[PDB]
Design a protein around this ligand. Structure first.
Ligand code: HEM
Length: 152
């Protein structure tokens, strides 16, 4: 379910993300590369990347576009942590292209893990972050399941 965050937890999320917020594209490029490298089955889900070696595409405009657009969404979710309706709208709006693409929860969860691992959070910040990400995935999966109108 959606579970609201406390005042301190909202603040913890902002602080957790702040290094990434200040280098959004650079962080995105590294994390997206690490994700495709660790979980190579996902590269085929991106038609623009499909059929090339990962090291051949990593320096391309198309790869960086994909990495950046993921991180832009998370940046906007972080922007909206004090606004449940606004946070939910951010997600609802990016959910469409993922609806009925054959991408498993496994795939999305593996991305979440790579993001988490890249942040090297202490357990306090980690817990607040996980509450936000749990909210993210609750909304996202409801929308994938055709229950997005409550959030759109
Ligand atoms: C879970 C975090 C994610 C975020 C924040 C995100 C965000 C986005 C955004 C902003 C779009 C473009 C929406 C539009 O055109 O209006 C998009 C498209 C797309 N996404 Fe994601 N996404 C995520 C996860 C993934 C994963 C894990 C995959 C595959 C494994 C994936 C595959 C795609 C594909 C194939 C497209 C259509 C774009 C294309 O053909 O490249 N996404 N995503």
């Amino acid at each position: 379910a959606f579970v609201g965050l406390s005042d301190s937890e909202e603040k913890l999320v902002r602080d957790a993300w702040a290094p990434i917020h200040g280098d959004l594209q650079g962080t995105a490029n590294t994390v997206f590369y690490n994700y495709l490298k660790k979980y190579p089955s996902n590269q085929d889900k991106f038609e623009t990347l499909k059929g090339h070696p990962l090291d051949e595409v990593k320096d391309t405009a198309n790869f960086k576009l994909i990495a950046g657009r993921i991180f832009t969404i998370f940046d906007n979710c972080v922007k909206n942590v004090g606004n449940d309706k606004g946070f939910q709208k951010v997600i609802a709006d990016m959910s469409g292209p993922h609806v009925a693409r054959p991408i498993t929860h496994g795939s999305y969860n593996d991305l979440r893990g790579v993001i988490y691992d890249s942040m090297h959070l202490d357990s306090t910040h980690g817990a607040a972050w996980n509450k936000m990400m749990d909210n993210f995935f609750y909304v996202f999966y409801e929308c994938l399941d055709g229950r997005c109108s409550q959030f759109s």
